[PDB]
Ligand binder design. Structure first.
Ligand SMILES: Nc1ncnc2c1ncn2[C@@H]1O[C@H](COP(=O)(O)OP(=O)(O)OP(=O)(O)O)[C@@H](O)[C@H]1O
Ligand SMILES: Nc1ncnc2c1ncn2[C@@H]1O[C@H](COP(=O)(O)OP(=O)(O)OP(=O)(O)O)[C@@H](O)[C@H]1O
Ligand SMILES: O=c1ccn([C@@H]2O[C@H](COP(=O)(O)O)[C@@H](O)[C@H]2O)c(=O)[nH]1
Ligand SMILES: O=c1ccn([C@@H]2O[C@H](COP(=O)(O)O)[C@@H](O)[C@H]2O)c(=O)[nH]1
Ligand SMILES: [Mg+2]
Ligand SMILES: [Mg+2]
Lengths: 465, 465
C-alpha cells in the first residue's frame, strides 16, 4: 500500500456535501487540513494552483519506477555500464528531503541545523563514530550549495534511489577502486560530484528531451490519480474568489494532463454539463520558471493555444478571456487579478520553489500538499506506543538508539519524511515555518466551510512561559 | 530605571555559593537561563566569549547618550545643520531590532515574515490604512538588504533614535520640501538612503576615528557595569574546560576594558591574589571581524602586546602561553583548542554576527545575552493581566487594537523587543531559532551546577499532535 493507493481510494469517492457529513469527514486525520499559522479563509480572494504533484498526483511506485527506468536508459546510452540495466526501483529505500553530499557520496538525513540524523553510503548505513571521520562535528554547512544538494520533491525520488544504487555498484565492483571523493577506473577518475551531475542531467533530459512525458500521457490511468471532486472544489472556489494555475510545465503537457483530470461525463456535480478544464481558471500561466517567478521572473509571453507555440514578442495586453500566458512573474498575477499577496492562497508541493519562496518573497498565504502524509499518518498512529515509549525514556541510552531505529524502519530504510525518532528533519522544520496550511491533498479544503478560521495557537518564548 | 540599573544591582552583589542558595536564586526570572534547545552542560569543553555588550555591558542611557552626542557632532562637522545640536537622546523611543527602510524613511517593527507590526516616519506613527500606501501588502522583502537595514545591537540604539529625529527635523522644517524618497532643499536632493548612509558612516567614524573610545575609558565607572562575580565564573569555567575571548574590538581597547572589569583587590573569590585578565583565557583573539570570522575569516596575525601593534606577517606558530591573536577564523579556535563546534558554547550579544552565524556556519552551541531582558521581564509580569486579557479576546476587534497599543507603550514608543501584542517580532523569532540558551546576563550560568542539563520540550508538528 502506497500513499497513492490511499489518495486514489479517497478519490474513488463521491462528495457528500451535507454540512454534518462534511464536519464528520474532516475529523479523520487523513481528510484534515493542518494549521501552522492562523488563516481566515474569508480573506482569501485568489486560490492559486500548481499542477504537477498538486492537481496531478502521479501514482506510486509506477511513475517513480518509470522515471527511474528511463534515467538509467539515458545514462547507459551516454556511456554508463550496462549493469545499471539490472537496477529496478525500490520504493522502500528513498525518503524525500535527503541531502546528497557530492564530496563523499553519501545520502544524509539532517535536521534544520545541518545535524546528521542518518548517513548512507550506497546501501550501507553509517552509524555513530564511523561517520565522525567525514563529519567530525556531525554537521553540514547548508550554505555550501555547491556540495550539498537537497532532494525536495517527489520528482527526485527516483534519483535518490539511483545515487544509492550507483555508489553501491561502483563500490562493490572490482573494476573500480574506491577513493574518498569518487572512483578510479584505470586512468579515468569519476568523482561523486560528476556522477551526481550526470544523474541530474539525465533526469532533466528524461523530463525534457526523453519520453517520460509521451509515456505518461499514453497511459494516464496507470500514472495519474483522477478525482471527481476536483471540479467541484474548483467551482466552489470560483464562487467566492479568483482561481489561477501557475505551472513550470509547458502548455501542451498541461493541456493533456488537465484535460484528463477533468474527464468525467459531468462538470462540478454529477448531472451537470461537462466543461473544459480552462473555464475553471481566471488566469492560466505556463513555463512559470519557479522559483525565479517569485523574483524578477522572465518576459510575459502569450500562448497560441492552437499550435501550442508561443506568440513572438512580449505580451503587453490585458487579461482577456481564453488567454494563456507563459513566463512572467508573481507580480503579473497580482497585477492581472488585482490581488495583494495576503489575498492569495497558493497551493503547491515544492517546499522550496512553491511555498518558501512565495511566502518570503511576496508574503502570499501558502498551502503545502504532502502526498506521503496519507501513509505517514497511518503509521504515526499504529506505532504511537513506539513513539510514546521513546518519549518516555527521554524523561526517564543504548535503548534510545535501538528504539529510534525500529520506529523509523516502519517508514522505510531512510525513515520518516518528518523525523528520526525525537529529532525533526529539515523538511519538517521548513513545513512548520513556511506552510501556513498543509495536508495529504488539497481536496481536504472541500470538507471545510467557505469562511472557516484555521487556528494555530500563539507561540510563547521560554521567558514568556 | 534602566536594564543597566537592574544589571548593576545584581552586579553589586557577592556570590553565595551554597548549593541551596544557588538553586533558590535561579528561581527568579532575572537570574534564570532560558532554554530554546536542550543543552547538556557536561558536553561543553570550551566557553567562548565576546566582550562588548557581553563581558563589558555599557551603562544605559549614559553610553547611548554619549554615542548619540558624538555622531550628531560628526554629522554637524561634516555639514549637517546646526539644529541637530539641540537633539538629545531619548531612551524611551528606540527599541532594538527595528528595520530602517531607506526608500521611504520609515522605522519598521516587523515579524519573522516581514509583516508590519509598527511603522514610524520620524515620530509620527503610521496606523492601519495610511501605511498600505507605501506597503500595499503590509510586508517587506527581508531579502532586499539594499533597502532595509536591521538595527541588531545595543550599538544601534543611538542611530535608531537619530534617524527618527532627522526625519522629524527635515519634515517639520520649512527650508526643506518633503518628497516620497527624501528631501529637497533648493537644488540639493537628500534621499533617506544617503541620509542613512551619512548616519551609518558617522557612527562608524565615532567608534573608529572619533573619541567615543577615549571618552569611555576615561570614565569607566560611568560607562561600564563591573561585577565581582565575573572572575569567579571564568575561573569556574576554566576548571572544567577551555575559555576564550573573540572580539571584533582591537587589543588596546580590549586591554583597557578587560583590565577594568577585573579590577578588584582579589582574584576569583575575596581573599585571593588578583590576577590579570589574560590569565583567565586559554586563547585571546582580537579584530575577529565577525561574521566574516565564521566563514573564510582573515589572515591570522599575532599581537605585539607591548606596543599594541600587529607583528608583520601571518602567524604560523602554535598556541603558546601569552600569545594574542588578531583576525583568523573560527577554524583557528577549533584547531588551537582542539574542539568541535558542539564542544563550544559561545556567549555573545549580536543575534546575527555572534549567534546566527556561529550556529549555521559551524554548529557551535550558542548563548545569547539580552541585557534589556532585565527590564522586559519586570514589565512582562506586572502587565500579565493586560496580556492574559488580550490572550482572552483572541479566544472570544477594535478592543484588540486598543489593548495591544497600551500593552506595548509600557516598554516604550516602539514597544517590546520581543512582540507587538500577540505577534512576535523578527528578533524574538531569531532568538528562538538560533540561541540555544539566552538570559539577561551570562553571569546567570553561575547559579547552575557544573553538569546541568538545560531541557527544552520536544516539538511536534500539528498532524503529530
Ligand atoms: N529546501 C531547499 N532546497 C533548495 N535550496 C534551499 C532549501 N532551503 C534553503 N535553500 C537555500 O540554500 C541556501 C543555503 O542554506 P541556508 O541554511 O543559508 O538557508 P536558510 O533557509 O536561511 O536556513 P534556515 O532554515 O536556518 O533559515 C540558501 O540560499 C537557502 O535559501
Ligand atoms: N538580523 C539580521 N541582521 C542582518 N542581516 C540578516 C539578519 N537576519 C538575516 N539576515 C540576512 O539578510 C538576508 C535577507 O533575508 P532572508 O529573509 O533571506 O534571511 P533568512 O534568515 O533566511 O530568513 P528566515 O528567518 O525566513 O530564514 C539574508 O542574507 C540573511 O541571512
Ligand atoms: O528534474 C526535474 C526536471 C524537470 N521537472 C519538471 O518540472 C515541472 C513541474 O511543474 P509544476 O509542479 O510547477 O506544475 C514538470 O513538467 C517536470 O517535468 C522536474 O520537476 N524535475
Ligand atoms: O557601528 C558600529 C561600529 C563599530 N562597532 C564596534 O564593534 C566592536 C564590537 O566588539 P565585540 O562585540 O565583537 O567584542 C566595538 O569595538 C565597536 O566599536 C560597532 O559595534 N558598531
Ligand atoms: Mg508541482
Ligand atoms: Mg559584542
Amino acid at each position: 500500500t502506497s500513499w497513492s493507493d490511499r489518495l486514489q481510494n479517497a478519490a474513488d469517492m463521491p462528495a457528500n456535501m451535507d454540512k454534518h457529513a462534511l464536519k464528520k469527514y474532516r475529523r479523520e486525520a487523513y481528510h484534515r487540513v493542518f494549521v501552522n499559522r492562523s488563516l481566515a479563509m474569508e480573506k482569501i480572494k485568489c486560490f492559486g494552483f500548481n499542477m504537477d504533484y498538486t492537481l496531478a498526483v502521479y501514482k506510486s511506485p509506477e511513475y517513480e519506477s518509470l522515471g527511474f527506468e528511463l534515467t538509467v536508459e539515458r545514462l547507459v546510452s551516454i556511456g554508463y555500464p550496462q549493469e545499471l540495466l539490472s537496477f529496478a526501483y525500490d520504493s522502500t529505500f528513498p525518503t524525500r528531503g535527503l541531502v546528497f553530499d557530492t564530496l563523499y557520496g553519501n545520502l544524509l538525513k539532517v535536521d534544520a541545523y545541518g545535524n546528521l540524523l542518518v548517513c548512507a553510503h550506497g546501501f550501507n548505513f553509517i552509524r555513530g563514530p564511523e561517520t565522525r571521520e567525514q563529519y567530525p562535528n556531525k554537521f553540514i554547512q547548508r550554505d555550501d550549495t555547491e556540495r550539498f544538494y537537497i532532494l525536495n520533491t517527489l520528482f527526485n525520488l527516483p534519483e535518490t534511489y539511483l545515487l544509492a544504487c550507483l555508489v553501491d555498484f561502483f563500490t562493490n565492483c572490482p573494476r573500480y577502486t574506491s577513493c574518498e571523493t569518487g572512483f578510479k577506473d584505470g586512468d579515468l577518475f569519476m568523482s561523486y560530484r560528476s556522477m551526481f551531475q550526470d544523474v541530474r542531467d539525465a533526469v532533466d533530459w528524461v523530463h525534457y528531451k526523453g519520453s517520460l512525458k509521451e509515456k505518461t500521457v499514453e497511459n494516464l490511468e496507470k500514472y495519474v490519480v483522477k478525482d471527481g471532486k476536483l471540479p467541484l472544489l474548483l467551482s466552489r472556489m470560483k464562487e467566492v474568489g479568483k482561481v489561477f494555475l501557475a505551472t513550470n510545465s509547458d502548455y501542451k503537457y498541461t493541456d493533456k494532463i488537465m484535460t484528463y483530470l477533468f474527464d468525467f461525463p459531468h462538470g462540478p456535480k454529477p448531472g451537470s454539463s461537462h466543461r473544459p478544464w480552462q473555464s475553471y481558471f481566471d488566469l492560466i500561466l505556463v513555463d512559470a520558471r519557479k522559483p525565479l517567478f517569485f523574483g524578477e521572473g522572465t518576459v510575459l509571453r502569450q500562448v497560441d493555444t492552437k499550435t501550442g507555440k508561443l506568440k513572438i514578442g512580449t505580451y503587453t495586453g490585458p487579461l482577456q478571456h481564453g488567454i494563456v500566458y507563459s513566463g512572467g512573474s508573481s507580480d503579473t498575477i497580482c497585477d492581472l487579478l488585482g490581488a495583494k499577496g495576503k489575498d492569495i492562497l497558493y497551493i503547491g508541493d515544492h517546499i522550496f520553489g512553491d511555498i518558501l519562496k512565495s511566502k518570503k518573497r511576496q508574503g502570499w498565504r501558502t498551502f503545502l500538499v504532502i502526498p506521503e502524509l496519507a501513509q505517514e499518518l497511518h503509521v504515526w498512529t499504529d506505532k504511537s506506543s513506539l513513539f510514546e515509549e521513546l518519549q518516555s525514556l527521554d524523561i526517564f541510552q543504548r535503548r534510545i538508539k535501538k528504539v529510534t531505529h525500529d520506529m523509523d524502519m516502519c517508514y522505510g530504510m531512510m525513515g520518516s519524511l518528518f523525523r528520526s525518532g525525537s529529532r525533526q528533519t529539515l523538511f519538517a522544520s521548513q513545513v512548520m515555518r513556511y506552510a501556513d496550511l498543509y495536508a495529504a491533498s488539497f481536496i481536504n479544503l472541500l470538507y471545510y466551510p467557505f469562511s472557516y478560521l484555521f487556528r494555530a495557537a500563539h507561540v510563547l518564548m521560554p521567558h514568556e512561559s
